[PDB]
Coordinates of C-alpha atoms and ligand atoms in Angstrom, one line a residue:
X11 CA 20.5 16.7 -21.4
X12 CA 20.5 18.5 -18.3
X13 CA 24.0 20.6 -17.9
X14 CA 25.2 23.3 -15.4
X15 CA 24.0 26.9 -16.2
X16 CA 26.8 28.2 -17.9
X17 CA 27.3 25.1 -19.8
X18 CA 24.1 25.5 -21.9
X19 CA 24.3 29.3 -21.9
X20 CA 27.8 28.2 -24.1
X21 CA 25.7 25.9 -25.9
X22 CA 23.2 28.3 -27.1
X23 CA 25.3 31.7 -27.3
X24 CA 27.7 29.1 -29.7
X25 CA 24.7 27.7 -31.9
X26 CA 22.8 31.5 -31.7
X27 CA 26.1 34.1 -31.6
X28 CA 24.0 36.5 -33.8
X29 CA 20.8 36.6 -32.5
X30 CA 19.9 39.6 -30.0
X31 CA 19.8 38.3 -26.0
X32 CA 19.0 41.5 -24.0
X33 CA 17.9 45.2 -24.5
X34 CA 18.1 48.3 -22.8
X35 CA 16.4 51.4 -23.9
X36 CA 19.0 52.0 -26.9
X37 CA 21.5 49.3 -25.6
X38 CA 21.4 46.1 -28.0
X39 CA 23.2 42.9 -26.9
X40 CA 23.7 39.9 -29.6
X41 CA 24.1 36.3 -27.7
X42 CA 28.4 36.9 -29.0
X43 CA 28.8 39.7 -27.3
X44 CA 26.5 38.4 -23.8
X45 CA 29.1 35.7 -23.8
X46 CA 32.6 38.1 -24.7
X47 CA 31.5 40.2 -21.6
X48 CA 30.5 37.4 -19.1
X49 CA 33.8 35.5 -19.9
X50 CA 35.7 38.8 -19.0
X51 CA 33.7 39.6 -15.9
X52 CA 34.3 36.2 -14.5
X53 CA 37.9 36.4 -15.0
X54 CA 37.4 39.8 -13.5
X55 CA 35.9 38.0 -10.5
X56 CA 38.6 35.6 -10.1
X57 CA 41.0 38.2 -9.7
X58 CA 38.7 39.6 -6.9
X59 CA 39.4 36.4 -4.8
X60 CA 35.6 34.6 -5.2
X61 CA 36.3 31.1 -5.7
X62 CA 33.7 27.9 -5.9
X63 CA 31.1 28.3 -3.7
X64 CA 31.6 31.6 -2.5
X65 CA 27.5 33.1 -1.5
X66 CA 27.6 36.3 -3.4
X67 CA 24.8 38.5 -3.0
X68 CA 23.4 41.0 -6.1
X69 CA 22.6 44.5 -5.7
X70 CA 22.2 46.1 -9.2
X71 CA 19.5 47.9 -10.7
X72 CA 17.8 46.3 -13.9
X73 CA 20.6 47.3 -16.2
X74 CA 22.8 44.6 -19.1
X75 CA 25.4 44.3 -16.0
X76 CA 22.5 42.9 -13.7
X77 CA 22.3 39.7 -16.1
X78 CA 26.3 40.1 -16.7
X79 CA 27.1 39.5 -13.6
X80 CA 24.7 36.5 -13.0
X81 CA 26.2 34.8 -15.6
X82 CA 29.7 35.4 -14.6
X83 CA 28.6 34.6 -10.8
X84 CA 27.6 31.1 -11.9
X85 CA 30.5 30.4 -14.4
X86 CA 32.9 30.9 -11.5
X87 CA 30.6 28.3 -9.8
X88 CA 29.5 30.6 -6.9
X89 CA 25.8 31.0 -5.5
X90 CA 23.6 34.3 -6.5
X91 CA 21.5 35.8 -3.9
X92 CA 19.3 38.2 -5.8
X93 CA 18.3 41.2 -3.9
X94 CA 15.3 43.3 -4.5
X95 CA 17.2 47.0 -5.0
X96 CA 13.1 48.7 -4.0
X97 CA 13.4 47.5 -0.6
X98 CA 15.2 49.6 2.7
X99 CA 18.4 48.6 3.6
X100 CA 17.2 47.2 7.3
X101 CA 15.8 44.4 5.3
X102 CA 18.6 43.7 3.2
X103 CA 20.9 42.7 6.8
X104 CA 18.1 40.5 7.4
X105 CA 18.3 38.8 3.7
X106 CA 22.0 38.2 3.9
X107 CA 22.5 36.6 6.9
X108 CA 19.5 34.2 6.2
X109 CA 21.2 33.5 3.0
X110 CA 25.3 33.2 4.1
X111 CA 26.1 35.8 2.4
X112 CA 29.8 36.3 2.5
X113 CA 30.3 39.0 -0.4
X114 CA 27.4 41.4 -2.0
X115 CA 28.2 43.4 -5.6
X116 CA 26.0 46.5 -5.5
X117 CA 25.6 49.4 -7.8
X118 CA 25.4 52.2 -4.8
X119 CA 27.9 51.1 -2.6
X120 CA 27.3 53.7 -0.6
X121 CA 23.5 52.4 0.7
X122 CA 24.7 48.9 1.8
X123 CA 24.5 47.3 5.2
X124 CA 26.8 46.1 8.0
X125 CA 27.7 42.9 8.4
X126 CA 30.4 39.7 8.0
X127 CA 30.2 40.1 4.2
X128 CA 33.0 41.8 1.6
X129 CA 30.6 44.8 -0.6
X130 CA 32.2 45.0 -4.1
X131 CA 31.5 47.8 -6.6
X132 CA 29.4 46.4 -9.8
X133 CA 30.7 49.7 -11.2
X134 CA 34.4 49.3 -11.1
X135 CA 34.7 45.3 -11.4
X136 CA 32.4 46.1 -14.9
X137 CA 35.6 48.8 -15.8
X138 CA 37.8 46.1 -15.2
X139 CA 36.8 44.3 -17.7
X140 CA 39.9 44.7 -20.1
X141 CA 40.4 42.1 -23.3
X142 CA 41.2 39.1 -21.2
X143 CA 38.3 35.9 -21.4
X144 CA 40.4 32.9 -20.7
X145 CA 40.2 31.6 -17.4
X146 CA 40.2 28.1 -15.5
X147 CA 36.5 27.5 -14.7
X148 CA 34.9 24.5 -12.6
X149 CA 33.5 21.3 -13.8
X150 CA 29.7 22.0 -12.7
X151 CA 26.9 19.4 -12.1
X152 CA 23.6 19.7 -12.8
X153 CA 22.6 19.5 -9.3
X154 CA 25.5 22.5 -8.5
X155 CA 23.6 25.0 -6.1
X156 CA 23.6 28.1 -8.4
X157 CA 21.7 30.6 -5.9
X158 CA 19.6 31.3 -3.1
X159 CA 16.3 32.5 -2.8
X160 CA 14.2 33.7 0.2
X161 CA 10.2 32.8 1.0
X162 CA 8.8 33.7 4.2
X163 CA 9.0 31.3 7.2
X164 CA 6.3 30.8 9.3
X165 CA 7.0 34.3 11.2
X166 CA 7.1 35.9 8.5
X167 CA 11.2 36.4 8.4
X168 CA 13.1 35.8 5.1
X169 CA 13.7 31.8 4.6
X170 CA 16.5 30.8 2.2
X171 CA 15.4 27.8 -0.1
X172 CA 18.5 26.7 -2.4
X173 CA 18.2 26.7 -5.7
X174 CA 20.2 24.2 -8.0
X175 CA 21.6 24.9 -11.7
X176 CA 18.9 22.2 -13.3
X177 CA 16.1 24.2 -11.2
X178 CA 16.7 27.0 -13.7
X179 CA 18.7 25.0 -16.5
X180 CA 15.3 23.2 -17.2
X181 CA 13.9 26.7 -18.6
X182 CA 15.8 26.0 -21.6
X183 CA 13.3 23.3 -22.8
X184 CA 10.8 24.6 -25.7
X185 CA 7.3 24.6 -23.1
X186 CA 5.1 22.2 -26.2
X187 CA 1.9 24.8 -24.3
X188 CA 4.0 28.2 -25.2
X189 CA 5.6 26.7 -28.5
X190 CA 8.2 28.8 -27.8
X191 CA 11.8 29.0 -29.4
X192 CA 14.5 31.4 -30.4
X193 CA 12.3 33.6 -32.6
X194 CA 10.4 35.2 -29.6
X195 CA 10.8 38.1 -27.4
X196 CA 10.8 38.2 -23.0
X197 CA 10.4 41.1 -20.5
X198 CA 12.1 41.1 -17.8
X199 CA 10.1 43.2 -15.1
X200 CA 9.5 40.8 -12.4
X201 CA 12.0 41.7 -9.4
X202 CA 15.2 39.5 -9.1
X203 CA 14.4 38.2 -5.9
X204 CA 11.2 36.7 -6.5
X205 CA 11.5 32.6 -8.3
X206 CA 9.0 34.5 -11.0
X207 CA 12.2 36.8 -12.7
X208 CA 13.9 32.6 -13.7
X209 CA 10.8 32.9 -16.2
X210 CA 11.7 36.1 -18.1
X211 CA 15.4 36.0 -17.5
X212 CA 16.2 31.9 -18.7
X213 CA 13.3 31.1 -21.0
X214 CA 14.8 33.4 -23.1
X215 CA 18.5 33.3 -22.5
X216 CA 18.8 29.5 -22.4
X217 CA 16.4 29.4 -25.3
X218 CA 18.4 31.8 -28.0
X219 CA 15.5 34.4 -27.4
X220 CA 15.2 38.1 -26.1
X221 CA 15.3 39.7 -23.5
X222 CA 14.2 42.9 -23.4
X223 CA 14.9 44.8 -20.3
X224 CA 12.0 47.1 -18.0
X225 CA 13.8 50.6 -16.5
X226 CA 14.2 50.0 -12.7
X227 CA 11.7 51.1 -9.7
X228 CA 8.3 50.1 -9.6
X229 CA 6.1 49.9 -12.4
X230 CA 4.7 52.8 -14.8
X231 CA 2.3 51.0 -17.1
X232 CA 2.8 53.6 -19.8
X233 CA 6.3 52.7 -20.0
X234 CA 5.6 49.3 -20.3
X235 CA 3.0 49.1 -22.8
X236 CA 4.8 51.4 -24.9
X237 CA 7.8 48.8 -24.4
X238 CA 5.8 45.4 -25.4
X239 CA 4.8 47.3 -28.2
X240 CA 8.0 49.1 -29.7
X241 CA 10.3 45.7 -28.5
X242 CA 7.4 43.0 -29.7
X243 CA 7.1 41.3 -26.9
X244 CA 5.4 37.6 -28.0
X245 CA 5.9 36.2 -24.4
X246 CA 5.0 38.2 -21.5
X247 CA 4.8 37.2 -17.9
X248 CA 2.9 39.1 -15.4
X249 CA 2.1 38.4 -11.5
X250 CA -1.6 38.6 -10.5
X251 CA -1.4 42.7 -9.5
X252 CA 0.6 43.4 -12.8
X253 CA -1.8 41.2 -15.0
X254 CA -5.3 42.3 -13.0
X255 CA -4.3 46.1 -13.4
X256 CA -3.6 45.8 -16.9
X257 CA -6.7 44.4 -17.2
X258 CA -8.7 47.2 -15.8
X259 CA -6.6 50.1 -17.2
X260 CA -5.2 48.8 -20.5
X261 CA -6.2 45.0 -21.6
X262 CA -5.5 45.9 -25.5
X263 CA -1.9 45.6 -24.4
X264 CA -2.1 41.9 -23.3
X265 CA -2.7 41.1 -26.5
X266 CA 0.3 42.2 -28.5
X267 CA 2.2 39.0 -27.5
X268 CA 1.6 35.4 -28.6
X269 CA 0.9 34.4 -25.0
X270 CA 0.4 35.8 -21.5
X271 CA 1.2 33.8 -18.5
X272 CA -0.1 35.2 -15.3
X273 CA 2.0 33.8 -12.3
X274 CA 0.9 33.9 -8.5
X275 CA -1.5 33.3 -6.2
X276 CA -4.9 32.6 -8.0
X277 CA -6.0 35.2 -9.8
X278 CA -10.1 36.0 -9.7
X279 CA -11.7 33.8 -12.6
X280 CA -13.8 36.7 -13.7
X281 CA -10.6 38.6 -14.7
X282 CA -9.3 35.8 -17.1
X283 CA -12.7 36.6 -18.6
X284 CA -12.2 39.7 -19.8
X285 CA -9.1 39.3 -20.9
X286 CA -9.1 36.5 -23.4
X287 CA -12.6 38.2 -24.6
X288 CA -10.6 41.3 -25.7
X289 CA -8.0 40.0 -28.1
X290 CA -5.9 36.6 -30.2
X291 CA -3.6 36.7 -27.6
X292 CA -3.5 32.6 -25.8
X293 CA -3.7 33.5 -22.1
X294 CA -2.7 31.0 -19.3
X295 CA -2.4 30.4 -15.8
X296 CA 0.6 29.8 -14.0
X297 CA 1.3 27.8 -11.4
X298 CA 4.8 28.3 -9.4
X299 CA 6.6 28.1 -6.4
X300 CA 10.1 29.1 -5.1
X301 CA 10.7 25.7 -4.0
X302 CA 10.3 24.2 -7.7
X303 CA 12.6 27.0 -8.7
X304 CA 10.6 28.6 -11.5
X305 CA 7.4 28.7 -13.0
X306 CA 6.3 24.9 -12.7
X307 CA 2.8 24.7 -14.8
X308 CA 0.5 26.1 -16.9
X309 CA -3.4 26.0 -17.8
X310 CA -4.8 27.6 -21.0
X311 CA -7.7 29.3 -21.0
X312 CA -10.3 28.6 -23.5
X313 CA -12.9 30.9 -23.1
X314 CA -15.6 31.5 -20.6
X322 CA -11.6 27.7 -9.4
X323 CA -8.8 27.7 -12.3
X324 CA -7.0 24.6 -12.9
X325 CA -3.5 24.2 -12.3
X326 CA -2.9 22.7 -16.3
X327 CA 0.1 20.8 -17.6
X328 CA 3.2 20.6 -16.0
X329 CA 6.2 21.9 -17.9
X330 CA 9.0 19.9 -19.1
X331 CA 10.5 17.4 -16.4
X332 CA 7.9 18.5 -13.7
X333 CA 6.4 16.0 -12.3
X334 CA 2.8 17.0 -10.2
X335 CA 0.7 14.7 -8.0
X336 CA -2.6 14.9 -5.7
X337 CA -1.7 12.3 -2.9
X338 CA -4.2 11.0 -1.4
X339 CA -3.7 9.3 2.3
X340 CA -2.6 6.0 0.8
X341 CA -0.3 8.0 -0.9
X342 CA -1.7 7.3 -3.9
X343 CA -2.7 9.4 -7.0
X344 CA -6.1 10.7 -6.0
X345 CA -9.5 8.8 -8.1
X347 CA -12.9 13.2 -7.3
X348 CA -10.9 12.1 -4.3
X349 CA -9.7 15.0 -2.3
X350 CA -5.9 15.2 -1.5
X351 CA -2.7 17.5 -1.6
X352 CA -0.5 18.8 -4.3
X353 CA 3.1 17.4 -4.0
X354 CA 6.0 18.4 -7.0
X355 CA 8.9 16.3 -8.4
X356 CA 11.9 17.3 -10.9
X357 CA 14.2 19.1 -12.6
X358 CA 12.5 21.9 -10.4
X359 CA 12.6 20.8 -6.8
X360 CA 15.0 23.0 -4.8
X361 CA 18.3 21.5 -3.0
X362 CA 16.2 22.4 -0.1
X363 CA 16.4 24.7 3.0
X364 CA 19.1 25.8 5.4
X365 CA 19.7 22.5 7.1
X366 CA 18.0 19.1 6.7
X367 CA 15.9 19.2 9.6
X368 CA 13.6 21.9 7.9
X369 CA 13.9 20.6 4.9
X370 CA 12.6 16.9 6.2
X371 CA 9.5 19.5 6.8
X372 CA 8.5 19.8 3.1
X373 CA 10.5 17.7 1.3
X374 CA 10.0 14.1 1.6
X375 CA 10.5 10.8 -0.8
X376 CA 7.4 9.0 -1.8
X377 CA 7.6 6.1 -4.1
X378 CA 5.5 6.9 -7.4
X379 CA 6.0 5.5 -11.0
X380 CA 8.5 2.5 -10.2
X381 CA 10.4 5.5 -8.3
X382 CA 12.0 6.9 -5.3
X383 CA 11.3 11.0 -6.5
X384 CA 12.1 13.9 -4.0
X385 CA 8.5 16.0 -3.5
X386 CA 7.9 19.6 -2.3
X387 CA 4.9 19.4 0.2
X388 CA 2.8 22.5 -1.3
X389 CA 0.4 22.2 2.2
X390 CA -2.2 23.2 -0.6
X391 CA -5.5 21.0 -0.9
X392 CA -6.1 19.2 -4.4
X393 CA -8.0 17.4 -6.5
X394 CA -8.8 15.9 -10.6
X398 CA -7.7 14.5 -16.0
X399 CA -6.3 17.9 -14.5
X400 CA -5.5 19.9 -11.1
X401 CA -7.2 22.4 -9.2
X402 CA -5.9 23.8 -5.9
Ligands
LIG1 BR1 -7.2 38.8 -8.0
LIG2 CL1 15.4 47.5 -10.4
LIG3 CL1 6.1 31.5 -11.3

């Protein structure tokens, strides 16, 4: 029951209207009014001449309007390109061009770059917004690109991978690991343009669940432990720095939520350690790449080279071996398949570099080629 983006934000803002879907210091949104004031701003947009397809880059502060206007952008059917507002505008030239970017909606119009793109104030278009929801939106498929995100190429320059609506639509699937639902409660503190913020933005807004909202800039713990607390956070993602720090300054506060999923690069064992030791809390691994659009699996850490874990929902993760067969002990590579797998890169010839079709199950499935070395059941990198 895979459906565009906007389709199954309808879905759950019509089934949830009065549950709470994001907060800001003292500003409280219920699902109703996320979906009033993202049908507005996307007529608003309309008016603005962006049409299907149009690239659209983000500029905006973690504010209600950042998540506004990514729900608007995809109703209208155009592509996001999130861009991390920390970083010196020499490097946001560098992003859009990688990406296409024909227009970019900032917050501070006055620090923007120069380039063939259209710069459109977040501030005004938001004013704009005046009583009027109906509009004529597109029919949008499941494999509709829905926005562009950058890794690093092999130089080390920005590299746009292309991110379809089911890449992201997918986080609305309860994760059976998580036992998550509508009742629980997501911060949103990784940066936009990083795959990690599809976590904490649609697990929870796909799901009927909150999202509660971290003040811009870079982090101050204090601030955010004193927000999982006051908000109740029950699901809290962290990358390796955010999660080992907390660990050595604060671990109590990992264990106010339900569950802790710790995203990134692998993460020393010994830290895992000490965390589950201190508290209830059910702490996992998390595996994920901005190829498979989001977080991708998960391993749960019982007590005390961490495994990769389950997959999540329509994931599908294999150790080839060079029969291209499932590895027996047998050494081999990590390959991913699914709702997950990105449209690919900027033009097919790099994308015949990772992304390749390997028979497996009764069935042709598109793979991402991780380059990472794997083994057994479960998965270690
Ligand atoms: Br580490
Ligand atoms: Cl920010
Ligand atoms: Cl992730």
């Amino acid at each position: 029951q895979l459906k565009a983006v906007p389709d199954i934000f309808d879905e759950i803002s019509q089934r949830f209207p009065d549950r709470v879907a994001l907060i800001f210091d003292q500003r409280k949104i219920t699902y109703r009014e996320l979906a009033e004031q993202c049908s507005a701003l996307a007529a608003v947009l309309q008016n603005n001449c962006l049409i299907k397809g149009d690239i659209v880059a983000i500029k905006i502060e973690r504010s209600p309007e950042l998540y506004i206007f990514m729900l608007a952008l995809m109703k209208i059917g155009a592509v996001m390109v999130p861009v991390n507002s920390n970083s010196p505008e020499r490097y946001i030239g560098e992003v859009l061009s990688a990406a296409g970017a024909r227009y970019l909606i900032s917050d501070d119009v006055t620090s923007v770059p120069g380039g063939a793109w259209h710069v459109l104030s977040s501030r005004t278009l938001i004013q704009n917004c005046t009583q009027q929801r109906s509009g004529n939106y597109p029919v949008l498929s499941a494999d509709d690109p829905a926005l562009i995100l950058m890794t690093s190429g092999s130089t080390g320059k920005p590299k746009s991978v292309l991110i379809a609506h089911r890449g992201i639509a997918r986080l609305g699937l309860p994760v059976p690991a998580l036992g998550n639902s509508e009742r629980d409660c997501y911060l949103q503190i990784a940066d936009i343009s990083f795959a990690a913020s599809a976590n904490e933005i649609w697990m929870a807004l796909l799901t009927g669940a909150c999202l509660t909202i971290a003040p811009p800039g870079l982090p101050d713990l204090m601030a955010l432990a004193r927000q999982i607390e006051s908000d109740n956070v029950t699901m809290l993602f962290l990358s390796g720095g955010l999660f080992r720090l907390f660990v050595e300054v604060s671990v109590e506060t990992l264990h106010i939520p339900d569950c802790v999923v710790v995203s990134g690069d692998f993460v020393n064992p010994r830290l895992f350690s000490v965390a589950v030791q201190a508290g209830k809390a059910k702490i996992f691994n998390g595996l994920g790449c901005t190829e498979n659009s989001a977080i991708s699996s998960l391993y749960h850490i019982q007590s005390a080279p961490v495994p990769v874990g389950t997959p999540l929902p329509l994931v599908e993760m294999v150790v080839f071996n060079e029969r291209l067969q499932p590895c027996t002990g047998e050494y081999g590579e990590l390959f991913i398949a699914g709702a997950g797998v990105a449209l690919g890169y900027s033009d097919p010839q790099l994308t015949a570099e990772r992304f390749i079709t390997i028979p497996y199950q009764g069935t042709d499935m598109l793979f991402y080629r991780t380059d990472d070395r794997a083994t057994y059941r479960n998965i270690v990198l």
